[PDB]
Amino acid sequence: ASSTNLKDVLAALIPKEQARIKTFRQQHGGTALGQITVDMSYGGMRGMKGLVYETSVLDPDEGIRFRGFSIPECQKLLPKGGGGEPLPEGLFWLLVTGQIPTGAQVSWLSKEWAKRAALPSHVVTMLDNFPTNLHPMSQLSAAITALNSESNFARAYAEGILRTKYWEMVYESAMDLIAKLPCVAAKIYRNLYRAGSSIGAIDSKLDWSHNFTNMLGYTDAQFTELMRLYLTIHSDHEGGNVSAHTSHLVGSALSDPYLSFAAAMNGLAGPLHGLANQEVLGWLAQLQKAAGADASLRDYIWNTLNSGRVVPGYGHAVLRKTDPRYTCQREFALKHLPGDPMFKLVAQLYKIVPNVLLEQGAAANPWPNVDAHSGVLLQYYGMTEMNYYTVLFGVSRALGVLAQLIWSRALGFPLERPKSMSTDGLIAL
């Protein structure tokens, strides 16, 4: 047939990457990066360099970057569904490499996951008897913890593999995870909202995104495409966010990938971490019954900002133009769902909001994010089961919390371990 080695590649790159970091820490190593304040301790390590996360960096001028590769350059580059919208595969490839997977490097992986894609009967069991009253983000988290039984790394932990051999199996757990994530999550849904029917089979002929949607039991061809672009973009976004930080912290403790990703979700399961996409959509909804004007919404938002309220969705700390990940989904409705009452709307906010904000001193990056653009698309296709949107966002962040997990292991990074505080101490300190 055809293919590239992935693991094979990975294996080659490393000593390259492990040498650059050793020269580096070897010279400039103890060079003075920053200061800690008694305020930043109390602020959640707020603006406190402490990462070394390597897959993505926020650029105040371009948005997020999957190397130097920004939202837009991936789009036209990462290899297409064979559609318009990119494959989370090539994306996951990119992230692990620093490279743009070619045709057969991407398909390489689809066949790869196709395969890897097997769920124990004990996780099937357990998913099945979960009471509906248990949130999806809760059942997910439990499955993955239960799937941890299957971990090649735990097992080679037991058996005594060696340091340097750490990645070559945190990788193996790594691919399987991603492979059987859409089964766990397809299963959740179906069980929840599709009157617990079957999730179906797995077609090796299909690429990740599609078997998800087809396990998800949606058939709209446009549907899958959104699947493909939604998994790519929600993917990664620095190593300081709840989800990533948490895969990282638990993972540091040499905890198999599975274990660090079901904690990573207890983290995403958070309110100040999991529900944004949702918040907005609800506010829009309210907008919804509260076709109309530039004039009336400019008036309502006006009132909103003035009545001490805020618009769920716009205004980023650093960002310094449109989160392109918003643009990405907007570049889509038009393609797609162009005269959609609720999209329309969304798109109005776009016209109105930035100005009002700027004009009503609550600026310097008044442009919307992603969380403003998705929910309106999910629902359009049928995806109205909102509690569930958090799983989709966990099925996507997957690709970028694993694809570095394998590198923290690979570079051989130590136990996260920040000496802790105490208010009586600092008072003397």
mmCIF file with all atom_site columns, C-alpha atoms in Angstrom, residues 138-295:
data_model
loop_
_atom_site.group_PDB
_atom_site.id
_atom_site.type_symbol
_atom_site.label_atom_id
_atom_site.label_alt_id
_atom_site.label_comp_id
_atom_site.label_asym_id
_atom_site.label_entity_id
_atom_site.label_seq_id
_atom_site.pdbx_PDB_ins_code
_atom_site.Cartn_x
_atom_site.Cartn_y
_atom_site.Cartn_z
_atom_site.occupancy
_atom_site.B_iso_or_equiv
_atom_site.pdbx_formal_charge
_atom_site.auth_seq_id
_atom_site.auth_comp_id
_atom_site.auth_asym_id
_atom_site.auth_atom_id
_atom_site.pdbx_PDB_model_num
ATOM 1   C CA . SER A 1 138 ? -19.388 12.547 34.136 1.00 0.00 ? 138 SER A CA 1
ATOM 2   C CA . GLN A 1 139 ? -19.869 9.294  32.332 1.00 0.00 ? 139 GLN A CA 1
ATOM 3   C CA . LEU A 1 140 ? -17.135 10.138 29.982 1.00 0.00 ? 140 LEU A CA 1
ATOM 4   C CA . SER A 1 141 ? -14.663 10.826 32.686 1.00 0.00 ? 141 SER A CA 1
ATOM 5   C CA . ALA A 1 142 ? -15.556 7.398  34.335 1.00 0.00 ? 142 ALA A CA 1
ATOM 6   C CA . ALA A 1 143 ? -15.194 5.335  31.061 1.00 0.00 ? 143 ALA A CA 1
ATOM 7   C CA . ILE A 1 144 ? -11.769 6.621  30.227 1.00 0.00 ? 144 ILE A CA 1
ATOM 8   C CA . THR A 1 145 ? -10.745 5.893  33.865 1.00 0.00 ? 145 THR A CA 1
ATOM 9   C CA . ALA A 1 146 ? -12.158 2.449  33.457 1.00 0.00 ? 146 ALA A CA 1
ATOM 10  C CA . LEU A 1 147 ? -10.437 2.105  30.041 1.00 0.00 ? 147 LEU A CA 1
ATOM 11  C CA . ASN A 1 148 ? -7.290  2.699  31.730 1.00 0.00 ? 148 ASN A CA 1
ATOM 12  C CA . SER A 1 149 ? -7.260  -1.153 32.298 1.00 0.00 ? 149 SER A CA 1
ATOM 13  C CA . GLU A 1 150 ? -6.024  -1.444 28.681 1.00 0.00 ? 150 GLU A CA 1
ATOM 14  C CA . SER A 1 151 ? -2.911  0.856  29.249 1.00 0.00 ? 151 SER A CA 1
ATOM 15  C CA . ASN A 1 152 ? 0.399   -0.462 27.538 1.00 0.00 ? 152 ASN A CA 1
ATOM 16  C CA . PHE A 1 153 ? 2.323   2.047  29.638 1.00 0.00 ? 153 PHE A CA 1
ATOM 17  C CA . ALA A 1 154 ? 1.016   1.005  33.091 1.00 0.00 ? 154 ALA A CA 1
ATOM 18  C CA . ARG A 1 155 ? 1.797   -2.418 32.232 1.00 0.00 ? 155 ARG A CA 1
ATOM 19  C CA . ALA A 1 156 ? 5.304   -1.632 30.881 1.00 0.00 ? 156 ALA A CA 1
ATOM 20  C CA . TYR A 1 157 ? 5.551   0.384  34.055 1.00 0.00 ? 157 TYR A CA 1
ATOM 21  C CA . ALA A 1 158 ? 5.075   -2.775 36.016 1.00 0.00 ? 158 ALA A CA 1
ATOM 22  C CA . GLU A 1 159 ? 7.400   -4.676 33.891 1.00 0.00 ? 159 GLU A CA 1
ATOM 23  C CA . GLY A 1 160 ? 10.208  -2.090 34.189 1.00 0.00 ? 160 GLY A CA 1
ATOM 24  C CA . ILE A 1 161 ? 10.708  -0.227 30.960 1.00 0.00 ? 161 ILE A CA 1
ATOM 25  C CA . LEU A 1 162 ? 13.392  2.503  30.878 1.00 0.00 ? 162 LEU A CA 1
ATOM 26  C CA . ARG A 1 163 ? 13.106  6.336  31.077 1.00 0.00 ? 163 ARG A CA 1
ATOM 27  C CA . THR A 1 164 ? 14.024  6.927  27.517 1.00 0.00 ? 164 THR A CA 1
ATOM 28  C CA . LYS A 1 165 ? 11.565  4.215  26.609 1.00 0.00 ? 165 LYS A CA 1
ATOM 29  C CA . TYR A 1 166 ? 8.728   6.267  28.116 1.00 0.00 ? 166 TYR A CA 1
ATOM 30  C CA . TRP A 1 167 ? 7.350   7.806  25.087 1.00 0.00 ? 167 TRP A CA 1
ATOM 31  C CA . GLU A 1 168 ? 7.371   4.723  22.999 1.00 0.00 ? 168 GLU A CA 1
ATOM 32  C CA . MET A 1 169 ? 4.334   3.596  24.962 1.00 0.00 ? 169 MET A CA 1
ATOM 33  C CA . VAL A 1 170 ? 2.689   6.536  26.122 1.00 0.00 ? 170 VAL A CA 1
ATOM 34  C CA . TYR A 1 171 ? 2.204   6.824  22.487 1.00 0.00 ? 171 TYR A CA 1
ATOM 35  C CA . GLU A 1 172 ? 0.588   3.357  22.177 1.00 0.00 ? 172 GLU A CA 1
ATOM 36  C CA . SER A 1 173 ? -2.013  4.364  24.906 1.00 0.00 ? 173 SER A CA 1
ATOM 37  C CA . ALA A 1 174 ? -2.061  7.657  23.110 1.00 0.00 ? 174 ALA A CA 1
ATOM 38  C CA . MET A 1 175 ? -3.378  6.408  19.802 1.00 0.00 ? 175 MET A CA 1
ATOM 39  C CA . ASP A 1 176 ? -5.809  3.913  21.176 1.00 0.00 ? 176 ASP A CA 1
ATOM 40  C CA . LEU A 1 177 ? -7.421  6.610  23.377 1.00 0.00 ? 177 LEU A CA 1
ATOM 41  C CA . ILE A 1 178 ? -8.236  8.875  20.466 1.00 0.00 ? 178 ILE A CA 1
ATOM 42  C CA . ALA A 1 179 ? -9.261  5.845  18.501 1.00 0.00 ? 179 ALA A CA 1
ATOM 43  C CA . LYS A 1 180 ? -11.985 4.744  21.052 1.00 0.00 ? 180 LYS A CA 1
ATOM 44  C CA . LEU A 1 181 ? -12.965 8.231  22.187 1.00 0.00 ? 181 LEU A CA 1
ATOM 45  C CA . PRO A 1 182 ? -15.721 8.551  19.544 1.00 0.00 ? 182 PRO A CA 1
ATOM 46  C CA . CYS A 1 183 ? -17.050 5.227  20.672 1.00 0.00 ? 183 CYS A CA 1
ATOM 47  C CA . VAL A 1 184 ? -17.192 6.247  24.237 1.00 0.00 ? 184 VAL A CA 1
ATOM 48  C CA . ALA A 1 185 ? -18.714 9.623  23.400 1.00 0.00 ? 185 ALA A CA 1
ATOM 49  C CA . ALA A 1 186 ? -21.050 8.139  20.550 1.00 0.00 ? 186 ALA A CA 1
ATOM 50  C CA . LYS A 1 187 ? -22.211 5.728  23.122 1.00 0.00 ? 187 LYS A CA 1
ATOM 51  C CA . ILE A 1 188 ? -22.882 8.373  25.703 1.00 0.00 ? 188 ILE A CA 1
ATOM 52  C CA . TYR A 1 189 ? -25.178 10.297 23.476 1.00 0.00 ? 189 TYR A CA 1
ATOM 53  C CA . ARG A 1 190 ? -27.118 7.483  21.934 1.00 0.00 ? 190 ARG A CA 1
ATOM 54  C CA . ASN A 1 191 ? -27.522 6.068  25.491 1.00 0.00 ? 191 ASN A CA 1
ATOM 55  C CA . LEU A 1 192 ? -28.604 9.570  26.736 1.00 0.00 ? 192 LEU A CA 1
ATOM 56  C CA . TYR A 1 193 ? -30.511 11.129 23.890 1.00 0.00 ? 193 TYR A CA 1
ATOM 57  C CA . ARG A 1 194 ? -31.029 8.487  21.288 1.00 0.00 ? 194 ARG A CA 1
ATOM 58  C CA . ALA A 1 195 ? -33.129 6.345  23.523 1.00 0.00 ? 195 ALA A CA 1
ATOM 59  C CA . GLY A 1 196 ? -29.932 4.144  24.328 1.00 0.00 ? 196 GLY A CA 1
ATOM 60  C CA . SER A 1 197 ? -29.871 2.443  20.944 1.00 0.00 ? 197 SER A CA 1
ATOM 61  C CA . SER A 1 198 ? -26.828 1.083  19.163 1.00 0.00 ? 198 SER A CA 1
ATOM 62  C CA . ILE A 1 199 ? -23.672 3.041  18.203 1.00 0.00 ? 199 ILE A CA 1
ATOM 63  C CA . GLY A 1 200 ? -22.973 0.773  15.401 1.00 0.00 ? 200 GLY A CA 1
ATOM 64  C CA . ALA A 1 201 ? -19.867 -0.500 13.752 1.00 0.00 ? 201 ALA A CA 1
ATOM 65  C CA . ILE A 1 202 ? -16.531 1.017  12.571 1.00 0.00 ? 202 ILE A CA 1
ATOM 66  C CA . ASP A 1 203 ? -15.689 1.454  8.947  1.00 0.00 ? 203 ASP A CA 1
ATOM 67  C CA . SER A 1 204 ? -12.095 1.232  8.090  1.00 0.00 ? 204 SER A CA 1
ATOM 68  C CA . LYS A 1 205 ? -12.792 2.940  4.860  1.00 0.00 ? 205 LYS A CA 1
ATOM 69  C CA . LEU A 1 206 ? -13.879 6.129  7.000  1.00 0.00 ? 206 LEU A CA 1
ATOM 70  C CA . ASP A 1 207 ? -11.669 8.876  8.480  1.00 0.00 ? 207 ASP A CA 1
ATOM 71  C CA . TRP A 1 208 ? -12.072 9.656  12.242 1.00 0.00 ? 208 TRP A CA 1
ATOM 72  C CA . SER A 1 209 ? -14.598 12.518 11.953 1.00 0.00 ? 209 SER A CA 1
ATOM 73  C CA . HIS A 1 210 ? -17.100 10.472 9.912  1.00 0.00 ? 210 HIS A CA 1
ATOM 74  C CA . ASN A 1 211 ? -17.211 7.311  11.803 1.00 0.00 ? 211 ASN A CA 1
ATOM 75  C CA . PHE A 1 212 ? -17.853 9.671  14.799 1.00 0.00 ? 212 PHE A CA 1
ATOM 76  C CA . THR A 1 213 ? -20.856 11.245 13.172 1.00 0.00 ? 213 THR A CA 1
ATOM 77  C CA . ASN A 1 214 ? -21.979 7.982  11.773 1.00 0.00 ? 214 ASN A CA 1
ATOM 78  C CA . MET A 1 215 ? -21.591 6.420  15.146 1.00 0.00 ? 215 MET A CA 1
ATOM 79  C CA . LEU A 1 216 ? -23.283 9.606  16.557 1.00 0.00 ? 216 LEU A CA 1
ATOM 80  C CA . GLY A 1 217 ? -26.031 8.612  14.010 1.00 0.00 ? 217 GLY A CA 1
ATOM 81  C CA . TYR A 1 218 ? -26.356 11.669 11.930 1.00 0.00 ? 218 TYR A CA 1
ATOM 82  C CA . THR A 1 219 ? -26.244 11.405 8.210  1.00 0.00 ? 219 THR A CA 1
ATOM 83  C CA . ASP A 1 220 ? -26.155 14.870 6.732  1.00 0.00 ? 220 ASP A CA 1
ATOM 84  C CA . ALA A 1 221 ? -23.064 14.989 4.649  1.00 0.00 ? 221 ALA A CA 1
ATOM 85  C CA . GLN A 1 222 ? -22.693 18.720 5.644  1.00 0.00 ? 222 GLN A CA 1
ATOM 86  C CA . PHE A 1 223 ? -22.921 17.466 9.124  1.00 0.00 ? 223 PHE A CA 1
ATOM 87  C CA . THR A 1 224 ? -19.714 15.550 8.901  1.00 0.00 ? 224 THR A CA 1
ATOM 88  C CA . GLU A 1 225 ? -17.802 18.222 7.431  1.00 0.00 ? 225 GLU A CA 1
ATOM 89  C CA . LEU A 1 226 ? -18.479 20.439 10.489 1.00 0.00 ? 226 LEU A CA 1
ATOM 90  C CA . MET A 1 227 ? -17.518 17.585 12.456 1.00 0.00 ? 227 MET A CA 1
ATOM 91  C CA . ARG A 1 228 ? -14.111 17.663 10.715 1.00 0.00 ? 228 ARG A CA 1
ATOM 92  C CA . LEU A 1 229 ? -13.490 21.431 11.287 1.00 0.00 ? 229 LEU A CA 1
ATOM 93  C CA . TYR A 1 230 ? -14.927 21.411 14.841 1.00 0.00 ? 230 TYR A CA 1
ATOM 94  C CA . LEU A 1 231 ? -12.642 18.705 15.970 1.00 0.00 ? 231 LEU A CA 1
ATOM 95  C CA . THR A 1 232 ? -9.576  20.451 14.468 1.00 0.00 ? 232 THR A CA 1
ATOM 96  C CA . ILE A 1 233 ? -10.079 23.903 15.932 1.00 0.00 ? 233 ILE A CA 1
ATOM 97  C CA . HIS A 1 234 ? -11.104 23.054 19.652 1.00 0.00 ? 234 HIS A CA 1
ATOM 98  C CA . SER A 1 235 ? -8.087  20.964 19.598 1.00 0.00 ? 235 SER A CA 1
ATOM 99  C CA . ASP A 1 236 ? -5.303  22.685 21.456 1.00 0.00 ? 236 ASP A CA 1
ATOM 100 C CA . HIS A 1 237 ? -4.803  26.149 22.974 1.00 0.00 ? 237 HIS A CA 1
ATOM 101 C CA . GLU A 1 238 ? -1.671  26.524 25.167 1.00 0.00 ? 238 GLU A CA 1
ATOM 102 C CA . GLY A 1 239 ? -0.674  24.319 28.126 1.00 0.00 ? 239 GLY A CA 1
ATOM 103 C CA . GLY A 1 240 ? -2.096  26.759 30.841 1.00 0.00 ? 240 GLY A CA 1
ATOM 104 C CA . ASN A 1 241 ? -5.730  25.937 30.349 1.00 0.00 ? 241 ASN A CA 1
ATOM 105 C CA . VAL A 1 242 ? -7.668  23.772 32.801 1.00 0.00 ? 242 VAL A CA 1
ATOM 106 C CA . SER A 1 243 ? -7.905  20.770 30.505 1.00 0.00 ? 243 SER A CA 1
ATOM 107 C CA . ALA A 1 244 ? -4.320  20.716 29.266 1.00 0.00 ? 244 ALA A CA 1
ATOM 108 C CA . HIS A 1 245 ? -2.708  21.876 32.568 1.00 0.00 ? 245 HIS A CA 1
ATOM 109 C CA . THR A 1 246 ? -4.490  18.919 34.180 1.00 0.00 ? 246 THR A CA 1
ATOM 110 C CA . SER A 1 247 ? -3.510  16.230 31.758 1.00 0.00 ? 247 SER A CA 1
ATOM 111 C CA . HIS A 1 248 ? -0.009  17.556 32.434 1.00 0.00 ? 248 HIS A CA 1
ATOM 112 C CA . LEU A 1 249 ? -0.061  17.653 36.243 1.00 0.00 ? 249 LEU A CA 1
ATOM 113 C CA . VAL A 1 250 ? -1.546  14.170 36.713 1.00 0.00 ? 250 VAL A CA 1
ATOM 114 C CA . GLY A 1 251 ? 0.395   12.927 33.804 1.00 0.00 ? 251 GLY A CA 1
ATOM 115 C CA . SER A 1 252 ? 3.690   14.213 35.323 1.00 0.00 ? 252 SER A CA 1
ATOM 116 C CA . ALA A 1 253 ? 3.094   11.595 38.079 1.00 0.00 ? 253 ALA A CA 1
ATOM 117 C CA . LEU A 1 254 ? 3.823   9.054  35.381 1.00 0.00 ? 254 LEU A CA 1
ATOM 118 C CA . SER A 1 255 ? 0.037   8.303  35.230 1.00 0.00 ? 255 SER A CA 1
ATOM 119 C CA . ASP A 1 256 ? -0.921  6.458  32.052 1.00 0.00 ? 256 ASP A CA 1
ATOM 120 C CA . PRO A 1 257 ? -2.406  8.685  29.329 1.00 0.00 ? 257 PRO A CA 1
ATOM 121 C CA . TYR A 1 258 ? -5.963  7.400  30.145 1.00 0.00 ? 258 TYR A CA 1
ATOM 122 C CA . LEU A 1 259 ? -5.636  8.470  33.742 1.00 0.00 ? 259 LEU A CA 1
ATOM 123 C CA . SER A 1 260 ? -4.536  11.916 32.832 1.00 0.00 ? 260 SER A CA 1
ATOM 124 C CA . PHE A 1 261 ? -7.232  12.533 30.372 1.00 0.00 ? 261 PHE A CA 1
ATOM 125 C CA . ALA A 1 262 ? -10.222 11.533 32.641 1.00 0.00 ? 262 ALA A CA 1
ATOM 126 C CA . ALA A 1 263 ? -8.900  14.152 35.140 1.00 0.00 ? 263 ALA A CA 1
ATOM 127 C CA . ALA A 1 264 ? -8.344  16.469 32.298 1.00 0.00 ? 264 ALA A CA 1
ATOM 128 C CA . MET A 1 265 ? -12.171 16.190 31.920 1.00 0.00 ? 265 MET A CA 1
ATOM 129 C CA . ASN A 1 266 ? -13.031 16.598 35.433 1.00 0.00 ? 266 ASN A CA 1
ATOM 130 C CA . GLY A 1 267 ? -11.284 19.954 34.685 1.00 0.00 ? 267 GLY A CA 1
ATOM 131 C CA . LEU A 1 268 ? -13.203 20.659 31.489 1.00 0.00 ? 268 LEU A CA 1
ATOM 132 C CA . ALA A 1 269 ? -16.337 19.633 33.391 1.00 0.00 ? 269 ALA A CA 1
ATOM 133 C CA . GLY A 1 270 ? -15.821 22.878 35.162 1.00 0.00 ? 270 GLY A CA 1
ATOM 134 C CA . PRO A 1 271 ? -18.241 25.821 34.879 1.00 0.00 ? 271 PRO A CA 1
ATOM 135 C CA . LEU A 1 272 ? -15.503 28.421 34.558 1.00 0.00 ? 272 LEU A CA 1
ATOM 136 C CA . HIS A 1 273 ? -14.027 25.861 31.935 1.00 0.00 ? 273 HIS A CA 1
ATOM 137 C CA . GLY A 1 274 ? -16.704 23.692 30.247 1.00 0.00 ? 274 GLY A CA 1
ATOM 138 C CA . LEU A 1 275 ? -20.000 25.789 29.610 1.00 0.00 ? 275 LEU A CA 1
ATOM 139 C CA . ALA A 1 276 ? -19.145 28.881 27.196 1.00 0.00 ? 276 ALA A CA 1
ATOM 140 C CA . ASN A 1 277 ? -20.389 27.726 23.959 1.00 0.00 ? 277 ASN A CA 1
ATOM 141 C CA . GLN A 1 278 ? -23.525 27.008 25.991 1.00 0.00 ? 278 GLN A CA 1
ATOM 142 C CA . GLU A 1 279 ? -23.800 30.297 28.021 1.00 0.00 ? 279 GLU A CA 1
ATOM 143 C CA . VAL A 1 280 ? -23.949 32.423 24.763 1.00 0.00 ? 280 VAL A CA 1
ATOM 144 C CA . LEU A 1 281 ? -26.354 30.238 23.015 1.00 0.00 ? 281 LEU A CA 1
ATOM 145 C CA . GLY A 1 282 ? -28.626 30.742 25.889 1.00 0.00 ? 282 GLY A CA 1
ATOM 146 C CA . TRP A 1 283 ? -28.319 34.436 25.854 1.00 0.00 ? 283 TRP A CA 1
ATOM 147 C CA . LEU A 1 284 ? -28.816 34.500 22.073 1.00 0.00 ? 284 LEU A CA 1
ATOM 148 C CA . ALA A 1 285 ? -31.858 32.303 22.741 1.00 0.00 ? 285 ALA A CA 1
ATOM 149 C CA . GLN A 1 286 ? -33.142 34.979 25.004 1.00 0.00 ? 286 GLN A CA 1
ATOM 150 C CA . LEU A 1 287 ? -32.279 37.597 22.505 1.00 0.00 ? 287 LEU A CA 1
ATOM 151 C CA . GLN A 1 288 ? -34.310 35.283 20.210 1.00 0.00 ? 288 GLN A CA 1
ATOM 152 C CA . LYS A 1 289 ? -37.806 36.255 21.564 1.00 0.00 ? 289 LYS A CA 1
ATOM 153 C CA . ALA A 1 290 ? -37.009 39.369 23.556 1.00 0.00 ? 290 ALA A CA 1
ATOM 154 C CA . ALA A 1 291 ? -35.919 39.744 12.403 1.00 0.00 ? 291 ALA A CA 1
ATOM 155 C CA . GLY A 1 292 ? -34.927 43.128 13.511 1.00 0.00 ? 292 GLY A CA 1
ATOM 156 C CA . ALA A 1 293 ? -32.459 45.918 13.239 1.00 0.00 ? 293 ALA A CA 1
ATOM 157 C CA . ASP A 1 294 ? -29.132 47.224 13.478 1.00 0.00 ? 294 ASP A CA 1
ATOM 158 C CA . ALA A 1 295 ? -31.184 49.693 15.439 1.00 0.00 ? 295 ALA A CA 1
#
